[PDB]
Amino acid sequence: DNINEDIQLVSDFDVQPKCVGQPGVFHLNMRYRPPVRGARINVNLVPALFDN
Amino acid sequence: ATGVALATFLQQFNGLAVFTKNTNIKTGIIGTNLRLMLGKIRKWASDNVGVLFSEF
Amino acid sequence: KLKLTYSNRLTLPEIAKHIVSPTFHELEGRAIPVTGVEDDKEGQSAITKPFALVGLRIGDTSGPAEIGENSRINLRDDFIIEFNFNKDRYKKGGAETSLFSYYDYESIRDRLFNAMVAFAGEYGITFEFVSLDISTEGDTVYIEFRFRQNFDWCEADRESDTVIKAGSFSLNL
Amino acid sequence: KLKLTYSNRLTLPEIAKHIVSPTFHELEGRAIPVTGVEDDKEGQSAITKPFALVGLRIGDTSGPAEIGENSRINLRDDFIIEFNFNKDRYKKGGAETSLFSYYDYESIRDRLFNAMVAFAGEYGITFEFVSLDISTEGDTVYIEFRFRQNFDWCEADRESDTVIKAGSFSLNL
Amino acid sequence: AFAGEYGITFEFVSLDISTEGDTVYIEFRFRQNFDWCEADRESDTVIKAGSFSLNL
Amino acid sequence: CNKQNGVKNILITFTHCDTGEVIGPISHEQPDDTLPTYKTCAWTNTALTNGAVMRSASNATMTLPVVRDPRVPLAWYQGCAQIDAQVEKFDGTVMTLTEGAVTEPEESDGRAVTMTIIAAEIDELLPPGSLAA
Amino acid sequence: CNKQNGVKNILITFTHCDTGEVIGPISHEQPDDTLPTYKTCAWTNTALTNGAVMRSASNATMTLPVVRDPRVPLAWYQGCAQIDAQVEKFDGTVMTLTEGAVTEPEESDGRAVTMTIIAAEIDELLPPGSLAA
Amino acid sequence: CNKQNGVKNILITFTHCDTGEVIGPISHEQPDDTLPTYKTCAWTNTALTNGAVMRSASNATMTLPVVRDPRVPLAWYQGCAQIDAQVEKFDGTVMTLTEGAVTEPEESDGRAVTMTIIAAEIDELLPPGSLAA
Amino acid sequence: CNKQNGVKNILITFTHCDTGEVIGPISHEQPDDTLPTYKTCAWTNTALTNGAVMRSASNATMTLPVVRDPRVPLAWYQGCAQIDAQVEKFDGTVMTLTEGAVTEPEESDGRAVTMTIIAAEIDELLPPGSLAA
């Protein structure tokens, strides 16, 4: 829907204090969404007779 | 039909900023003024000639 | 981090405070902004050495500058940094070093450029180098750098007059 | 609104009255247009401070200016706005501030440019910035601006000689 | 000779000569063109990890 | 002020063909001194012999250099979006265009852009006192 | 007088093809130093060999840069209107054209316009003392 | 920051079509003041008439002048290698390209090189606050 | 050294097609400031749509302006002889070419000559520490 929000990146160095940030950890958040496939169809069949 | 069409068209101006003392618009602002609105109304009116209006 | 008055260029005091003072410890501060290096020129020489001045040379434009018309505005500035240092005289072997002798400037140039590039990368402000000159006067040596800034300019913010909410059309005959 | 002598340019009194006086309250008026900024330097230095002068530099042409021939005519006007301000000294901590020290011009520039933009948008007259220079003299600091106007010129409103209603068409052999 | 040996070259600008009593002054003017670079620096860290929470 | 030349405002209102998003009118400022240009009459005359000409159908165009707005994807200024634009000069003239389409876009460097727009018709509003409809 | 080069007047009389409206002669002034140009002979000569040129039919033309009159729609200076024009030089010459048609109009920026007119004939009036009809 | 124009980083990741060797993202610096250029929208519009246009496939392109890296064979900066590149401007924009192919290379002098890259798609990352996906 | 741009040597070894004569390597010096140029990748990429490209065969080329050696016939610098060449830049690079052929020779004035050479392959030798074969 909006690529600029559905994926966010987080690094270990954002929160922990001075030098506590351990070397080489980064957090990734991604919002999956399955590809839609057809599932069900409703049919309304309306017969009539020749006319006019 | 003309009334409903025009009313639908004008709707897009709702909530739009306006400047009248000094017509310069700062860069990046969303807005307009009297002259621009008049011009756009004239454009829309000219478009529909022949379907609803006789040529002015 | 710091707080900048402007978003895309630095006033001379900001330079003297954040680029010159923290880089040269030899100067116990004394990075003094001034109106112009063409100065009283007497009290200028009396400041304790070493010290460095920062002063505008001329404001200028680098292209179109038509104020008011809805077009970009390209201002430009020329400011110069001038240092002042003593002279060392180590008098080796029953002989003194001459009152004039090669004085190392390359190290000063390198240090200044490195600090400038570091800051520019950190915040996104860059300078244009223009020239370098050196001269001596008895005890003191004058080293003069000329720089230049390019930046856009914008007008202050403003308040709208009103907003639309509805419209009374007539549709006469 | 105001009433302008011309429809596309401002005479120096008009600037001194409508761009300088209403913006800088520090000047209790005292935005005096003068013939030339080099004129009578003495009396020109005795007016009460602060004050600002407006004076023509020179008038020339930005293109073709052949008078009479039925082509456009372009003209230029170089004028300079020069201010005068005192120095503020506040003696913090048993130590006076030096007679020469950095003086804030950026605020003056911003205020002036904003006023010029406002007026230009309001009426439709625009200026070209040229350069800015600053220097100090004892108690007073001279901030000097240079500007330029571009405009067309037209001739006065002449009156016809007659009108046409007739025909002879003799149509000889 | 030196330039061939190490790879540094100069630009010649002009030659001027003048005399003064006993001594003669010969003044050469030269010029150098070269690139400049910034001092070396140390990385902040290295990378080895991954979380990829993969929310709904 | 019928005796000065310059641009006073520029507005643009993007629309996305595929998704149908809309971005309300946004001001813009020019990158250099070049002004826009126009061509309103929709017919094109080709020369023949003895003063005859071949009158044929053709588009009405506009050329419009603008500094990019830092909030809109660059792709929208090129052929990926549908455009509506206006210009107001000092002397009071106003030029209005709608349903424009960009053509043969040239490469841009990320801040300055030139757009070549064509449309079925461009409308011009004169200052007060016109001598014709 | 006899030994000065320059333009002295320019008149134009627009007619609208589709509606028949007319606007009486209106003066005009040039945007820059470039003077108009001309070609009055209707025929054209190709080379061939041994001086055996080939004569054929062509059009009288005229090139006329003029600053727009603020009261006339811009379109009328392009393919949308029929044009009549005149020029008076200082020395006394007068170039008259009628039923002109504008061709392949280049884009204009709203104040300076260049017109390429073609017509079946252009008549030149000389100062007194001409040596030919 | 926002109101300044310039390039801030450039990265490249060569891949060799035949051997399959890879060289990790290496920085680069520019030879002169010319900035890169882009063209991201993957479609092209032709004129036609009455405002219509013909819409077609086209590509996404990039132009990228960079100073050679003394450790990489010159040939790899021409049509012998597959390229992945990125650019970061001062204001925060980032332009990413992948599996580019260098096309119609022009001769080079060994230190300055210009590449014309085309790719199926180019992605733009705007600074915070964008108004569209 | 590593950060200076310039040429350091040029060698050439002429062979005569019709007679088989040979002239051992002879140094040369440039007529002006223009450096040689190169293109080493043999293939050429044309641009299709959607990022595809048509790959085909081409020739390595070199461009070499040199001041004539006063002892060699001028013809041998033009299409009458087979050429082998080398270049050594300051930083250490070395460009080697063999069995080149001269093409479409432009007129020379007897002292400064420009050669457009084409050959099957050109091999580049890098300074120490290369990242690829």
Automatic annotation (TrEMBL), chain B:
Q: Which organism is it from?
A: Agrobacterium phage 7-7-1
Q: Superkingdom of this entry's organism?
A: Viruses
> Which residues of the complete protein does this chain represent?
393 to 448 of 503
Q: What is this protein called?
A: Tail sheath protein
UniProtKB/TrEMBL annotation, chains C, D:
User: Organism's domain of life?
Assistant: Viruses
Stated name of the protein: Structural protein
From TrEMBL, chains F, G, H, I:
This chain's protein is named: Structural protein
Which species is this UniProt entry from? Answer: Agrobacterium phage 7-7-1
